[PDB]
């Protein structure tokens, strides 16, 4: 018999594509399907990084620039004094302000000649809030529910989700804080573990709690430039002068480090491995805690084959993501600062392994490893006996 | 009720009963303007391509395009009871535009 | 000629003859961008939802789905001669999704 | 006896929703329907308020700042002389300028230490144009037609319109000008009359005409203070120096106050009421007349248990809608300025009653009190005897 | 065969078989958000202006409105075998809105 | 017998349009159709001019302004010195720079008195690239393929194209550079030959090669005024100095003028045609060669009834379209630069004939004379026998 062409609308097939995901702040299982995933070719990570750059640029656009503070400072933390113009242009008034050591260079501010300093707007905050990346109509976001997932490879338990979970945009350099933990084992994923250039991402099945503090009791002082331009800075400290530190329980870190070493030995050949030490922005552990930007020295943790106290520095002028042509002055926070977080992931780089990485893109690649964006193609053709 | 794309692993005979589950969710209204405009255009392009061939608003319709064995020589029970739509699309990805223009030619002729 | 939306207070036995003047106004082509995209999306959503059910080209259509008494058990004289469309929308409001799902399933046969 | 499902299109039902009403610059009567209204929870007021602020911020964006003003003004209305830089950077010229008294704080401009002063472009015009708010396809606007509607509660007679009437964006603090008169009587309406903090909106049925004038013959002069940057100031006055005043007929105002008292005593208990007097933006009557922002002392209108002359002052630096950082230098206008207006409504605040009009959203609640936006839902299902 | 808009010089009888190549390319696929929304709105305006009259799913439709000789009165073979579409659009340009209103009125019954 | 009206969709007819085309960086013959064209009321010229002005203004937005250069200069091409501030705002220092004669007036800069000088950003370049204009969906672009087309009138060979040919947005005043050559013969076209006001566009069938060079060996120097605001200028010249000039073959230009005079004698009456010489912006040949804006004296070419050498000057500060208060500082290039270009067109003005081309829309009328945009109207009605 002859066979004739039919057309079907609503065919359940998909093809790979890139779309314009939007932020937002159901799940069905897909049986008998073996869609393959790849964590190192995701467009969602690039789109998330571009959106974070676009959001950080837009918040610092309208408010005050710190051009008139590129003056000579008579510094004696440090106590410094300078000449500055008051709101009347003809009059010049002497003032004073405390500065941290990393903000000043022999004094003057550290980022005068490099780029222009735009002060952060005095009411904004850097508290991370969860962001769900969601796909428009006609697209779908797949998820791989395999427990032993390694990144590049085919999945056996694929599911279509409405959109992603609560990805918190936490900024960190070496230890990934407040992330999502693995289900069964400590999992190490790399694009090529036999290459020295490629970074190594570790995910911990059990978190390590970290406590950090700034015991100096600062107070906030305001300095006026002219019409409608102000500047907030520390005036004095009411109390004893102390350093800022972070505490990690040593037994938890030792057990976690033993598990990392065991699984990393299992991935590599049967050889001994040692953990070694790592510009303060790429060497030290950089994160924000309560509004202040800490820079903590992590050479005590990675020194292997009660508590551990890590000394830290506070920095107010930051120029992260290496954008030449922009800088940022975070306003100081009055009172004591205390915060706690869970260590979830560590970024390693090649016997000898050391924490390394100035890219902030690998922080979000450890959250978006389960997901993939597809495009629905509902039209289909098939032969039927008679039409 | 298997939900949206729930019958993607089911056979072509079984997945043909869930066309309205997928077809209801191609259109929005469930910064952001690009996504909504893109969804509207993808649905509208598919609807225009369906309406050019004829019979957009009803099920039973005559097409009168003969099937070529060079496209697929597989028996019909093997098509409709053994495989899914994904490998069928993989088999007939390159031949699809010929089928589309033959359906368009049979519309006016 | 009652005009647009003027049969809202009438009973649904008499309001059902006036559906043309409500249908003819909901059109396109006659903060601008948000309003235009919203109007396009609402028109396309109504047309797609009407076209999946069958009867895309007419205002009064009726399917093979049997009415369940659990949704509403009152008689036709109570429905069509005692109540307006607002009250009837208030009765079966939580059962609209089940009825729409049953209509979409029955049209696929 | 079997009932089968029938699908109707064009069903006349609606639900409450908030939409994006677009500006533009027909009524049908709905019978046997009762719809409740609430003008304090109306969303058209917030939409109009945000649109007017966005229009003002769009107008003040490219029209250049006033820095380097705020130099030390030496003043003898006032005659002030100051040193300013010329178009060449390293040279200083001497200029003189006539400024009003309220623009000057002890000299120095009034908005120097609070906000950046963006000068207003000389093309600009503050004349109100009527704006009709229209609803898109699928939405509708319901109008309440009760002649004694008190703002809340159900409305017996409801009608539907495509767009609102000619709402004029008149900015005025204490006395509403060029508004919509009531149908029958003076109507006093409030959210609840027992709370003293809630504002009281009075709407008159007979308008009271006001005549305001600026009898000084000012001349305008351009001062250039930079490369391609210049601004306009009053050069000199020709003729006798006179004050700006507004004239109100005393018989009309006495009858208006007696009607307001007569209708207001019907709400409160049996108690005599007295009108008492009320930072010039909130204390005295501030309004625009011919391009100059008059500030008129209204203690004679509200002092009770031929013509009434109210003295007025002129300001050129205003910072409307209470937002810090957005002041505007209004350019002066040469020649005598005269305007006439119709007094439509008075804003009151608690017996003793004094005018308080600090917010600008109560100017637009007196116009958008009839209207309400709804979302039409054309689909519907019902049982019949088909098939 | 003649490509997009290639039968503009031919007669109506020759160009009536090739309406698809002008009908297909009215969608996109070849700030720019506004022009893109404008293209979608123009296509939807033409589509629902067609859909008010009936025959939403076809390119050639036939209506019940009788032809009036006041609009044009020349012979049918001259119209359908000798004249281009543009010359006919020039002739009845004063009466297109009236014919559209009569077609809209007849479909209302 | 009896006829009924029928509706057709996809009808090949079109009407006039004024839509906004989109940039980009298929053809159908259309037998048996005639369309009228008009290059003087063509709307693509205004669209191209608005787009070019918008991109040229957008490219000059983010980077540095030269307000601090507006200071007196103690000059000895001139060697000038000035005083600016350092990167530190407190102290000042003395620098020197080499400026051309056309950029200074008796010494201050050319446009500090009226305009705002903005430096062209060092990342961007002035090299033109081909630009294709494509009609949006629902519209079409018609092209007239007639070889004898005189600018307005009916066209016999009309064809439809998706996008226009590659048009380079070159900058020229008197001689059209790198344009589209005529098909077979030198063609003159104008709006009204008897009108003195209307310009004259001349197109050539064979091009004339022009070679221009800058023999000085300039060296780039960097100058800073503060945080992140740099400035580039010539530091010194290595070797002997020599003026810039352009070379043109004399016999080829003489034959070109003979053919031009023949066609001007054909269009006008049979009489004596004489060419005469033509503010450096409109008198001299203003064009770009290798990144520096040349200004060449052209009185040798247009004086008639081996090579020829035209002296040229160099401007660093230009103002395209003579915008009110906005100009541009082009940063100088280091070392010698040479360039070569085709001469394909001359703009003339009326017998005596003098070249003047100060408007840049007549530059682009020579490239978009073949094109026209139309709007497709796919609906149509026609009587048919069948009901
Ligand atoms: C993080 O903390 C560690 C430990 O506090 C820092 O390591 C310390 O680095 C300094 C300078 O590199 C070492 O000083 C050196 O001492 C040797 C004698 O041992 C002397 O010969 C050298 O001339 C120099 O003075 C110091 O010994 C070393 N601490 C330890 C325990 O070895 C590290 O620098 C910190 N990280 C950063 C980024 O600053
Ligand atoms: C972070 O970890 C460090 C070290 O584990 C903690 O430092 C410890 O703090 C306690 C209480 O402040 C100290 O105890 C005190 O010792 C003194 C003698 O020095 C004694 O006179 C007091 O009565 C009291 O017992 C303890 O000595 C100190 N340990 C070290 C090695 O210095 C620190 O408190 C932790 N911080 C947080 C926020 O958890
Ligand atoms: C495959 O993934 C699914 C994920 O849905 C697993 O099924 C359960 O799904 C429910 C749905 O909400 C979850 O709440 C459960 O946590 C899932 N797991 C269990 C154990 O119930 C399913 O188990 C996975 N199968 C395999 C073989 O990994
Ligand atoms: C990881 O990268 C290394 C890079 O050295 C790859 O090793 C080489 O791959 C090339 C390409 O086929 C071979 O010709 C070489 O013989 C390989 N070895 C060496 C020592 O150069 C390696 O294949 C990569 N691994 C994965 C899984 O991609
Ligand atoms: C940190 O410093 C602040 C600023 O002096 C302290 O706050 C003061 O505390 C005293 C004692 O209770 C009060 O009398 C003052 O009124 C407080 N000042 C303000 C501005 O509130 C604070 O107590 C200090 N904290 C510690 C732990 O030393
Ligand atoms: C970080 O600080 C928290 C308190 O904010 C610590 O939690 C306390 O831990 C002690 C000792 O384990 C317990 O006795 C308390 O009951 C805990 N209190 C709370 C509120 O949890 C936590 O231990 C600190 N982390 C580290 C590593 O020391
Ligand atoms: C996924 O594949 C499995 C394996 O074939 C399906 O399970 C059985 O499929 C056969 C083939 O039709 C049926 O005869 C059996 O009745 C199925 N088992 C059960 C328990 O029903 C399974 O149905 C497939 N899943 C989907 C969604 O199609
Ligand atoms: C405006 O007037 C209406 C009546 O037209 C008031 O509504 C009444 O409110 C009282 C107090 O809650 C109720 O007991 C009545 O049943 C209401 N009547 C109706 C018809 O709903 C309304 O309260 C008035 N608004 C104000 C602010 O006073
Ligand atoms: C505004 O009202 C005042 C009344 O206070 C008017 O002033 C009077 O004008 C008449 C006519 O010129 C004089 O005879 C009176 O002597 C004035 N009264 C006083 C107290 O001076 C004034 O003319 C009115 N102005 C306008 C424009 O109507
Ligand atoms: C407010 O009203 C009172 C009473 O009407 C005014 O007081 C009168 O002022 C006049 C003018 O000086 C005197 O001749 C009367 O004797 C006063 N009467 C009383 C009872 O005091 C008062 O002047 C008014 N205030 C203003 C600003 O107009
Ligand atoms: C511009 O610079 C020149 C130097 O290049 C200045 O000329 C010197 O002036 C001083 C004081 O008048 C004399 O002692 C030197 O002998 C001059 N040198 C030369 C080479 O002439 C000149 O004065 C400067 N111009 C101004 C206005 O200051
Ligand atoms: C009318 O114009 C068309 C182009 O729009 C000309 O067609 C071209 O003819 C040349 C020479 O025969 C061919 O090399 C090209 O390939 C043709 N173009 C296309 C798109 O086919 C045509 O010759 C012109 N006719 C006249 C009489 O001038
Ligand atoms: C071209 O220019 C000529 C003059 O140079 C125009 O001719 C004049 O047109 C005006 C307006 O119609 C008449 O009042 C004059 O009498 C005309 N003068 C002559 C000498 O004819 C002519 O209209 C312009 N346009 C065209 C298309 O030729
Ligand atoms: C272009 O070159 C000619 C060369 O002759 C210049 O004309 C001379 O200009 C100077 C200065 O004004 C006069 O003294 C001569 O008498 C002129 N000679 C002639 C023959 O006219 C002309 O000025 C130059 N043009 C420009 C813009 O540089
Ligand atoms: C314009 O052209 C005329 C004609 O060639 C030039 O006049 C000649 O100039 C040369 C140079 O001095 C003399 O030797 C000839 O005798 C002149 N001939 C005549 C007829 O006068 C004139 O110099 C040219 N002008 C410019 C500015 O280039
Ligand atoms: C441009 O034209 C000039 C002539 O105006 C050429 O200059 C000649 O160059 C040759 C070789 O260098 C010399 O022998 C001649 O004496 C020069 N003539 C004159 C009048 O000076 C020059 O070569 C041409 N080309 C370039 C690239 O400049
Ligand atoms: C105009 O000048 C250009 C170079 O500036 C000439 O273009 C080159 O000419 C040679 C010789 O025919 C070709 O081999 C090259 O392919 C051409 N380059 C390009 C990019 O097309 C051109 O010949 C000159 N003349 C005309 C009439 O354009
Ligand atoms: C008596 C009076 O004030 N008349 C004015 C009138 O002169 C003006 O043209 C118009 C424009 O707003 O406003 C009113
Ligand atoms: C089927 O396709 C082949 C090429 O794929 C072609 O040669 C053959 O003619 C086609 N069959 C028919 C009946 O046209
Ligand atoms: C009516 O609805 C109830 C509850 O949803 C269900 O149990 C019953 O089977 C339904 N009846 C029919 C005839 O579908
Ligand atoms: C035909 O058109 C003319 C136009 O004047 C009109 O008067 C006449 O009634 C029309 N005839 C019919 C049958 O509609």
Residue numbers in the entry:
A (entry chain B), D (entry chain A), F (entry chain C): 32 to 56, 82 to 132, 154 to 183, 191 to 330, 332 to 363, 367 to 393, 410 to 416, 419 to 456, ...
B (entry chain b), C (entry chain a), E (entry chain c): 519 to 548, 574 to 652
Q: What does the publication say?
A:
Interaction of HIV-1 envelope glycoproteins (Envs) with the cellular CD4 receptor and CCR5/CXCR4 coreceptor mediates virus entry into target cells. HIV-1 Env trimers of most primary isolates prefer to adopt a metastable closed, pre-fusion conformation and transition, either spontaneously or in response to CD4 binding, to downstream conformations. Subsequent engagement of the Env-CD4 complex with the CCR5 or CXCR4 coreceptor moves the Envs down the energy gradient on the entry pathway, culminating in the formation of a gp41 six-helix bundle that facilitates the fusion of viral and cellular membranes. HIV-1 envelope glycoproteins (Envs) of most primary HIV-1 strains exist in closed conformation and infrequently sample open states, limiting access to internal epitopes.
We solve the cryo-EM structure of an unliganded, incompletely closed T/F (1059) SOSIP Env and identify structural determinants of protomer flexibility and increased sampling of incompletely closed states. To gain insights into the structural features of the incompletely closed Envs identified in this screen, we determined cryo-EM structures of 1059-SOSIP, and for comparison, of the well-characterized BG505-SOSIP. We obtained cryo-EM reconstructions of unliganded 1059-SOSIP, resolved at 3.6 Å with 737,588 particles, and of BG505-SOSIP resolved at 3.7 Å with 975,399 particles. Within these 10 subclasses, we observed a larger range of protomer motion in 1059-SOSIP compared with the limited range of motion observed in BG505-SOSIP. HIV-11059 Env resists VRC01 neutralization despite strong binding of soluble monomeric 1059 gp120 to VRC01, suggesting interference with access of VRC01 to its binding site on the native Envs on HIV-11059 virions.
